Design a protein around this ligand. Structure first.
Ligand SMILES: [Mg+2]
Ligand SMILES: [Mg+2]
Ligand SMILES: [Mg+2]
Ligand SMILES: [Mg+2]
Ligand SMILES: [Mg+2]
Ligand SMILES: [Mg+2]
Ligand SMILES: [Mg+2]
Lengths: 233, 222, 212, 222, 198, 204, 196, 198, 196
């Protein structure tokens, strides 16, 4: 047992014809406070993987260490470490999951919701959830905690099913996923404006598109609202 | 405080056909009032012509299966790839399951296959270990909506021979696999209509004396 | 649940229902509540399925070891004692289970030991445990005598269990019957309560209040 | 429970699904969460069903009495004020959240009242469990000045959002429309996306399967 | 709880009711009648909460007797039990419910047949061939289901009941100090006082 | 700590082509101990029918309360209460006691003597109305009933068949519910004539 | 929640956000937290939704009734009216409520009726979920009375930083100018205050 | 709780101990001896927690018999009870205490006099003329304070005790199903089996 | 409790109050909240007394032992040492702790190891009971690096207002100058900051 102290909000993601995407604002909250305006929630592993973490930063920072520390560990006595024999996304996650479980099974978890994304050497898309409880699942769309309730909806309008991935253009993926990111900021107290998106395409590769703003918002209409029922003037 | 458990809905089903066996169970996955994945398999082949599935709490579930699929593998290593008679597998599972008696696996698990005579065989499990040779069992959320039905349809419970007054119960007869799968799909649709935690799709593993077959049929995304 | 066992002129009689139940809903009516520990012994099943089932099989193993070592049949008293000791090891842990361990040895004659999760070892001539234990102790108390036709003993068992089934919502299904002797136990099949009831009320004339 | 409302250039539209839960069970496959307060003022309400109904019944009842006596016409805020004054007089003990909307001899109107006495206003409001999905839809596809067609299209596609990604809601769509000069049209089930597929087997029983012990012909009148 | 039994037979009804009274530890009186004749042919045994019990009974009793001299005509077992149930129905949702269970035995003179009504404190009534409130049923209900026949003589009933008792003694933890038995018939009420020497 | 679940019982109704049906079990007992097998949850007020599940005294009290009121209606209005009308009433009635609710689960059904249209309804303990065109279920084994009905209801059965369906629906769901049974009874409502039938079932 | 009211040379002006949160979710990110009771008397609601809303309604009533017989009422005459309501029911009420009004004679007055019911005439007051970080700014960067436009900035930056560190409070800014002139309805869209 | 009595007299000791066994509601065996002879001249009655009881007794027994053949010399009542108290003393601060109370009756052969030690589960010992664990004392202690004399014959004792019993029956709520009585003296142990026909 | 550390052109300087409260009472209104682990590495303790005190002792040990074999250690090399202690025991520890140190090469670094164990290199950090009101000032009135004396004011005024609105934090101010020069021990008596 324990309690979460600093908190990362959501992490949204989806697959497309070539590869996958995964975004997550850069805010680490201290309850109702925002003691940290610019914090990294996307650890790319190798160059075919990235990990969007959502929950406790103290815990998240630990994992990072386990990754870099596992990564440096693959090298060790193995020449093909940059080509044939090298970390696939499916691996890391498998190891990650393994861990999260032992933990809940030891009554002391890591307060985190995690997404593993990337592409398999043989070209396949990978996207899978894994939280403090050691639970997991694949899906064309995936969002952590706050996401899934609000993001997933729109992301499912692009891909209602597995039979749409083939026809999901890298650009249509992006803009939509960002419209989602605008919405997460429209109705969620835990969210930030700055963020970090990343793409892993089997053709182009990894494209860490760090630090951006959420633009284009209809606020003007605000001026028209007055009172709550009677208050006219 | 920390709550180490959770429910991901799901409903599975096992019928012991005369000389076959089915293990069906939908593909939905849930949390509170949300969705996780439209498609997520809970039924698996573990080799040796044996199917399994554990519904309740995913993590405890898939761990058990994993923990089992490995215990099968190791059985071959020590006994020269001898086949695991289904009955055996179950006595084995009992233990695995009972291993975590005072911190159980929060799940209702079921297996199905064939005995050392060719007869279909199903096995229902307690979340800690009690196993029974069932010839038909539904486990999961919808459980109470399908079990009453199979009661009736599969065993003709409360059905008598007309004109006999109510002195002659209608005799059981064994239905072909086709016949069974028709029942099964109907069961699930009815269940999806009246149960929120159930819908989306249905994946069926059919066991027979030459392998495992898989057939899928889509349900409503209610 | 309604299980029971009793001693008599011909040996031992064991009778059970078969209704498992989660809350208000009936999970199964196909429950084996008699653990065939080994060819010569039987354990009933109250408390909590897994516990009885598991340990009682564990026990069955234990006998095989002893017997092989000694080239002699293990005696009931001991068998029971062992289970008890093992159970006591866990008093406090949350083990729940009622149970009759029945046997008929060379010397001991017929003998029942009720045993429970609390470490109560008890020699006796009649035992009923479960929800229906109360109604079953009725029929039994009045109708019991030590010289029963081997067949009547079997009948008493049925009927007793039947009373409970009718009334105790949490009990019912089908009845299982076993008889025990110096050379081992013998199954006396399964009886659907539904069918049976109608029969008894008919032949026996009892169960008047019931319509039809 | 999943509802919304959106006013356009000459009026306002509210819509709500038709499924009523009960823990994990579906009680009514066809319910009308859309009630009439008065010809031009209507409501949609979520949360505790019996509360939401009876309450509008009450208010509709009084507002009628009012207009008659006043010989004028029902103002929207009249209804609002009535609701939330009584509604809060019972500090929360009456779970009923709702989107009140109509048109009075001074404009088109749309509000949202919480179960405690809170009232809000915007151009579009969503209340219910799937209030988030249908919120996200309206928060990307909304632009000032939409038409009978633009708005409608939207409202119904917002509801659709909840129907799919949220469990607590489903079946068909209910819609109602008020136009600044025109009448009001109640469109029970403007849509019907969810429809059970034709079953597999025919379950009708052969006459005389059920055992009967007695029978007669019960009495009625004097 | 205490013991309250009742059984309807041929042309009568029989009420059993334990005699002991307990205050936590000691047992005060042990020759206590938990009965209260409502009218010449109606009678009511009861068990329940310490104070709630004896008050309610007398109160019900009062009303009846009142009705019966006012009208000069006696009230029917059927209707009687209806009213008792009425009162408890309200009682249950009162600022303070009388926690009490009862059995009501009477001989309906118009039908010339005996009726017996069991009623719990929640206001739950039912005409029965026989009954017992509380744990009392568990131990006996079977024997009754077994041997009971609608045609039994008054004596037949006693024997049966007597057997039920012997059982209650044998398997019940509590010492109920015996029982007082009573019969309602076309002749009225009398007490089988003999059940001490019997 | 649930009241509804203390006494037991179930009730179900269906609409046929030109008629209706409604049946219930017979069991009544405090939790485990079964007490009666002659306790009926269905009565009527002239040509209108009501099935009530839930807490026993509350059931009885309701019947009395309704018999009372319908008598008084038919009197001043020189005509028996109509179905649709009754519904709206029993509805309000349940609510008047919304803060000391009656723990029950009613179900109304009948045939309107003017339009000739079959009718069925169900409500929660406070009067929320569930208008349906196929079937209504209330009681302990609510969930088991929906499983049967969903498979067996067929739009517009012949009265003689509808009987067989509903009978089986009730009958079978009742066996997977530990707290209902001990007999049952089914009524079949035609424009004129009505047939009451008791059926044979497991008595455990 | 994030409100306040400031007095100066031409009177006083009160401003607040638009963000209202149920849990970590935004119910209506466009709230008119500023409320009118009388023509030259308004107030900004803090804390509980349903409660604050109803209080006002009642008050609005008392005053609009006072006038019809006792002429136009003071700003102090108004505060006391909330004093009563707030006090009497302190047990079933959650309200931070700040009141402000102007009269040519006594200029514009500022009174805060925080939780409990205690009343206060200060130069300016600030309440609401995120008032907690402007105890630094406000007090320090406060010159005795300013100009119309000069003041509009205190409001502007005080309010700006409060959004920057308190999620429970955000949305747009809205001001209400109460002067000799009359009432002026302000509104400062996002991309503005953030820039600062 | 159960019934455990004991009384030291002239050249003997007497132990009473109820016979019934209960599992919440029903009563299983009702002819159960809560005794356990430790050595030819030492004896111990007991009452306590369901499992705790019978295990501990036998365990104590084991040790003694062990000591008695090892040494070939028998152990004195005094010393025995000392040891029992020892074990319980530890038991009470153990991860799990054996909740059990006891009476120990023996005939010290060297002194040629009978000793009786009462001991609760907390490890509280005391040599007494007579005693009773649990609620048992309340009902009887007076009668003993009254009629008891150190010189009483073995018979005198039985009568007394018999009277204490008749009382326990009369004012105790529970039905203890009678009692098994036993005597320890210069001759050893024997059972007054006659207390059924007596 | 009220601490912080700020970096600039010559390095970094950290300052805090002296007030420590048990309930509404002042245990020792003269606390040396600034603590030394190494010569050019110090820290300011927040939250729990007994805990923070002991953590330091241990760390001081590790470092004073590191050097004796691995030369002089970094400022990052030090933070990580607190990371371990803070994390591992998050369940029996209450510590806001801010760390600061300088090295000629990388100038002076500022890291904050708040409750939980999460570490952070910021321009400057602020923790302690009364940090809550200087989220307005600090951030707004912050120019990228300043001068020795120029900076001494951020500290001075940030700290001043925190006393003005937070009783649990007060006393005198104390600064510790960490530069190329060396360590300089500051102290600003009451009647001063109040005046501002
Ligand atoms: Mg094998
Ligand atoms: Mg039963
Ligand atoms: Mg849905
Ligand atoms: Mg139900
Ligand atoms: Mg049943
Ligand atoms: Mg904000
Ligand atoms: Mg201070």
């Amino acid at each position: 047992t324990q309690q979460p102290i600093v908190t990362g909000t959501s992490v949204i993601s989806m697959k497309y014809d070539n590869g996958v995407i995964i975004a997550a604002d850069n805010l680490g909250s201290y309850g109702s406070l925002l003691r940290f305006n610019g914090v990294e929630r996307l650890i790319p592993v190798g160059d075919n993987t990235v990990v969007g973490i959502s929950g406790d930063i103290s815990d998240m920072q630990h994992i990072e260490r386990l990754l870099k520390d596992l990564v440096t560990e693959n090298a060790y006595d193995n020449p093909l470490a940059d080509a044939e024999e090298a970390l696939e996304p499916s691996y890391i996650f498998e190891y990650l999951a393994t861990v999260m479980y032992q933990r809940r099974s030891k009554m002391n978890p890591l307060w985190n919701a995690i997404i593993v994304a990337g592409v398999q050497s043989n070209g396949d898309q990978f996207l899978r959830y894994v939280n403090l409880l050691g639970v997991t699942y694949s899906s064309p769309t995936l969002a952590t905690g706050f996401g899934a309730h609000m993001a997933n909806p729109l992301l499912r309008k692009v891909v209602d099913r597995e039979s749409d991935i083939p026809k999901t253009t890298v650009q249509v993926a992006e803009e939509a996923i960002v419209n989602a990111m605008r919405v997460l900021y429209y109705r969620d107290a835990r969210s930030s404006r700055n963020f970090s998106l990343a793409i892993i395409d089997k053709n182009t590769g990894l494209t860490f598109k760090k630090n951006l703003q959420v633009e284009n918002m209809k606020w003007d209409f605000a001026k028209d609202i007055k009172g709550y029922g009677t208050q006219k003037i | 405080q920390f709550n180490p458990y959770g429910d991901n809905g799901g409903t599975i089903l096992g019928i012991a056909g005369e000389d076959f066996a089915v293990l069906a169970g939908d593909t939905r996955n849930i949390t509170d009032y949300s969705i996780n994945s439209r498609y997520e398999p809970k039924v698996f082949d573990c080799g040796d012509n044996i199917v399994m599935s554990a519904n309740g709490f995913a993590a405890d579930g898939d761990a058990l299966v994993k923990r089992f699929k490995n215990s099968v593998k190791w059985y071959h290593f020590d006994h020269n790839d001898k086949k695991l008679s289904i009955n055996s597998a179950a006595r084995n599972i009992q233990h695995l399951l009972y291993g975590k008696r005072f911190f159980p696996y929060y799940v209702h698990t079921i297996i199905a296959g064939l005995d050392e005579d060719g007869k279909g065989a199903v096995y229902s499990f307690d979340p800690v270990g009690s196993y029974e040779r069932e010839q038909c069992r539904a486990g999961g959320a919808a459980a109470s909506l399908i079990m009453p039905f199979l009661d009736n349809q599969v065993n003709f419970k409360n059905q008598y021979e007309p004109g006999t007054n109510g002195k002659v119960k209608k005799p059981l007869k064994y239905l072909s696999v086709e016949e069974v799968i028709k029942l099964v799909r109907d069961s699930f649709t009815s269940a999806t209509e009246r149960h929120i935690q159930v819908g989306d799709g249905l994946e069926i593993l059919i066991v027979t004396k030459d392998g495992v077959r898989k057939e899928f049929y889509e349900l409503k995304r209610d | 649940t309604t299980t029971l066992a009793f001693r008599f002129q011909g040996g031992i009689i064991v009778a059970v229902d078969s209704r498992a139940t989660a809350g208000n809903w009936v999970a199964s009516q196909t429950v084996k509540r008699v653990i065939e520990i080994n060819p010569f012994l039987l354990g009933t099943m109250a408390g909590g399925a897994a516990d009885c089932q598991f340990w009682e099989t564990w026990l069955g193993s234990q006998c095989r070891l002893h017997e092989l070592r000694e080239k002699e049949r293990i005696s009931v008293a001991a068998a029971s004692k062992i289970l008890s000791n093992l159970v006591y090891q866990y008093k406090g842990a949350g083990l729940s289970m009622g149970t009759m361990i029945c046997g008929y040895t060379r010397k001991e004659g017929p003998t029942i030991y009720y045993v429970d999760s609390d470490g109560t070892r008890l020699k006796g001539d009649i035992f009923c445990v479960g929800s229906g234990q109360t109604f079953a102790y009725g029929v039994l108390d009045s109708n019991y005598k030590w010289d029963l036709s081997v067949e009547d003993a079997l009948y008493l068992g049925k009927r007793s269990i039947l009373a409970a089934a009718h009334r105790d919502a949490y009990s019912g299904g089908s009845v299982n019957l076993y008889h025990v002797t110096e050379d081992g136990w013998i199954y006396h099949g399964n009886h659907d309560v539904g069918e049976l009831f109608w029969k008894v009320k008919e032949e026996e004339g009892s169960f008047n209040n019931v319509i039809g | 429970t999943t509802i919304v409302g959106v006013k356009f250039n000459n009026g306002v539209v509210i819509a709500a699904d038709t499924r009523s839960t009960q823990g994990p069970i579906v009680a009514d496959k066809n319910c009308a969460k859309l009630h009439r307060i008065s010809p031009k003022i209507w409501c949609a309400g979520a949360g505790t069903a019996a509360d939401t109904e009876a309450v509008t019944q009450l208010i509709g009842s009084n507002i009628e009495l009012h207009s008659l006596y006043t010989s004028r016409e029902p103002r929207v805020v009249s209804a609002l004020q009535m609701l939330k004054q009584h509604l809060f007089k019972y500090q929360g003990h009456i779970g009923a959240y709702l989107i009140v909307a109509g048109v009075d001899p001074t404009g088109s109107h749309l509000f949202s009242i919480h179960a405690h006495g809170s009232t809000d206003v915007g151009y579009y409001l969503s209340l219910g469990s799937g209030s988030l999905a249908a919120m996200a839809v309206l928060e990307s596809h909304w632009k000032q000045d939409l038409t009978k067609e633009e708005a409608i299209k939207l409202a119904s596609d917002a509801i659709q959002a909840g129907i799919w990604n949220d469990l607590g809601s489903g079946s068909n769509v209910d819609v109602c429309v008020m136009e600044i000069g025109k009448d009001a049209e109640y469109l029970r089930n403007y849509l019907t996306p969810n429809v059970r597929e034709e079953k597999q087997k025919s379950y009708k029983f052969p006459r005389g399967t059920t055992a009967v012990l007695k029978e007669s012909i019960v009495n009625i009148c004097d | 709880m205490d013991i309250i039994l009742g059984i309807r037979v041929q042309d009568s009804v029989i009420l059993a009711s334990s005699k002991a009274v307990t205050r936590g530890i000691s047992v005060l009186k042990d020759s206590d009648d938990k009965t209260r004749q409502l009218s010449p042919h109606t009678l009511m045994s009861f068990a329940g909460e310490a104070g709630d019990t004896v008050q309610f009974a007398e109160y019900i009793q009062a009303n009846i007797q009142l009705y019966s001299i006012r009208e000069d005509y006696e009230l029917s077992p059927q209707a009687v039990s209806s009213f008792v149930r009425q009162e408890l129905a309200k009682s249950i949702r009162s600022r303070r419910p009388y926690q009490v269970n009862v059995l009501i035995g009477g001989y309906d003179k118009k039908k010339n047949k005996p009726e017996l009504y069991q009623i719990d404190y929640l206001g739950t009534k039912v005409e029965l061939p026989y009954g017992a409130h509380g744990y009392s049923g568990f131990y006996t209900f079977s024997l009754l289901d077994h041997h009971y026949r609608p045609d039994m003589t008054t004596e037949e009933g006693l024997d049966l009941l007597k057997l039920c008792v012997q059982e209650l003694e044998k398997r019940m933890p509590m010492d109920f100090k015996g029982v007082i038995v009573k019969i309602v018939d076309k002749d009225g009420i009398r007490q089988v006082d003999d059940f001490q020497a019997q | 700590s649930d009241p509804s679940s203390i006494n037991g019982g179930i009730v179900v109704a269906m609409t046929g082509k030109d008629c209706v049906a409604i049946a219930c079990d017979l069991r009544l007992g405090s939790q485990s101990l079964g007490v009666s097998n002659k306790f009926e949850k269905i009565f009527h007020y002239g040509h209108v029918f009501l099935g009530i599940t839930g807490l026993a005294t509350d059931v009885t009290t309701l019947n009395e309360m309704f018999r009372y009121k319908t008598n008084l209606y038919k009197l001043k209005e020189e005509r028996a209460i109509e179905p649709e009308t009754f519904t709206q009433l029993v509805s309000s009635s349940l609510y008047e006691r919304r803060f000391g609710p009656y723990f029950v689960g009613p179900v109304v059904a009948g045939i309107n003597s003017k339009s000739g249209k079959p009718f069925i309804a169900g409500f929660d303990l406070i009067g929320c109305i569930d208008e349906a065109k196929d079937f209504i279920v209330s009681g302990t084994a609510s969930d088991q009933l929906f499983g049967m009905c969903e498979s067996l209801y067929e739009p517009n059965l012949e009265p003689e068949d509808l009987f067989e369906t509903i009978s089986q629906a009730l009958l079978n769901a009742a066996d997977r519910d530990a707290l209902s049974g001990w007999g049952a009874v089914v009524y079949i409502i035609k424009k004129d004539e009505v047939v009451k039938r008791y059926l044979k079932m497991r008595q455990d | 929640t994030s409100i306040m009211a400031v007095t100066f040379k031409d009177g006083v002006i009160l401003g607040a956000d638009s963000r209202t949160t149920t849990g970590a979710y935004i119910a209506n990110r466009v709230t008119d937290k500023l409320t009118r009771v009388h023509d030259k008397i308004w107030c900004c609601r803090s804390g509980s939704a349903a409660d604050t809303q109803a209080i006002a309604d009642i008050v609005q009533y008392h005053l609009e009734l006072y006038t019809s017989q006792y002429g136009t009422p003071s700003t102090e005459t108004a505060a006391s009216v909330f004093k009563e309501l707030c006090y009497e029911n302190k047990d079933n009420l959650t309200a931070g409520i700040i009141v402000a009004g102007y009269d040519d004679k006594n200029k514009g007055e500022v009174y805060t009726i925080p939780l409990g019911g205690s009343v206060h005439k200060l130069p300016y007051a600030i309440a609401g979920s995120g008032s907690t970080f402007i105890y630094g700014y406000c007090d320090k960067n406060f010159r005795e009375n300013m100009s119309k436009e000069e003041t509009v900035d205190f409001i502007k930056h005080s309010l700006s930083q409060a959004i920057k560190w308190d999620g429970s409070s955000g949305g747009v800014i809205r001001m209400v100018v109460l002067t000799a002139a009359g009432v002026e309805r302000l509104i400062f869209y996002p991309d503005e205050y953030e820039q600062l």
